[PDB]
Amino acid sequence: AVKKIAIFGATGQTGLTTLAQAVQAGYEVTVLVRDSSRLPSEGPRPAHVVVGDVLQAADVDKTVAGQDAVIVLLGTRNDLSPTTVMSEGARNIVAAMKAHGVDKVVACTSAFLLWDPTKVPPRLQAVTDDHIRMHKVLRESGLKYVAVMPPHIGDQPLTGAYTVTLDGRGPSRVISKHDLGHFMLRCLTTDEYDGHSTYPSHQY
Numbered sequence: 001a002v003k004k005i006a007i008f009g010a011t012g013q014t015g016l017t018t019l020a021q022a023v024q025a026g027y028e029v030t031v032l033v034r035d036s037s038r039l040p041s042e043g044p045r046p047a048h049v050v051v052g053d054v055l056q057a058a059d060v061d062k063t064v065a066g067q068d069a070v071i072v073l074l075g076t077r078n079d080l081s082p083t084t085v086m087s088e089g090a091r092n093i094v095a096a097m098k099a100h101g102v103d104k105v106v107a108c109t110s111a112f113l114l115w116d117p118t119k120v121p122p123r124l125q126a127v128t129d130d131h132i133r134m135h136k137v138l139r140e141s142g143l144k145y146v147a148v149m150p151p152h153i154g155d156q157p158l159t160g161a162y163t164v165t166l167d168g169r170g171p172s173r174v175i176s177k178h179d180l181g182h183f184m185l186r187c188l189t190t191d192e193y194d195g196h197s198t199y200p201s202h203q204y
């Protein structure tokens, strides 16, 4: 099966809980981080740490080296400014995966990619524009791409009881970060989501 995985964005809101969950599942986890201060120093911890930036292809190449699959949870935290970090980072990730024969990438964009584009809140259009750019990168890559498109990410506890809607909008507008990370790892265990959009949501 999949044993060795790389996570990008592992120090983020969803990355931290995905990292913990993956380590407890038994995965051998490699992370690319800009600052190891934002990784936990005890408890569930990754087996390999690369220090660097997803914009530097050499750093991405040594993170993807030797992996079986890739989880992408890159984002901008509280910065809503125009950016190309996620799409450019995604071009780096795709090339390193092809250079190392990795096929499986599970990447998080957002449910707004399933919305009427005129209906996106103006404050979120700039970030959304780069999710679109990133989704196009991965769609065009030809890899085995699970497009995870969550609605609002909350901080409710882990339930593992969430719904997953394929290629459409789901009946709830929230997923907890813990259930979102749980589902990113579920995508590693099956190929039933490959080439589909997935919307995870639950009522808390």
Ligand SMILES: NC(=O)c1ccc[n+]([C@@H]2O[C@H](COP(=O)([O-])OP(=O)(O)OC[C@H]3O[C@@H](n4cnc5c(N)ncnc54)[C@H](OP(=O)(O)O)[C@@H]3O)[C@@H](O)[C@H]2O)c1
Pocket (backbone or CB within 6 Å): 008, 009, 010, 011, 012, 013, 014, 015, 032, 033, 034, 035, 038, 052, 053, 054, 055, 073, 074, 075, 076, 077, 078, 085, 086, 108, 109, 110, 111, 127, 150, 151, 152, 153
């Ligand atoms: N919040 C929501 O309601 C919501 C809803 C739908 C979709 N989403 C999308 O879901 C995704 C994840 O959300 P999130 O809140 O879990 O992520 P997040 O809290 O914003 O964490 C972002 C991650 O990306 C990393 N990162 C940013 N730039 C990087 C770079 N140049 N090189 C390496 N790493 C870099 C950050 O590392 P650092 O720690 O060094 O900054 C961090 O680990 C995002 O794309 C977000 O837009 C969010």
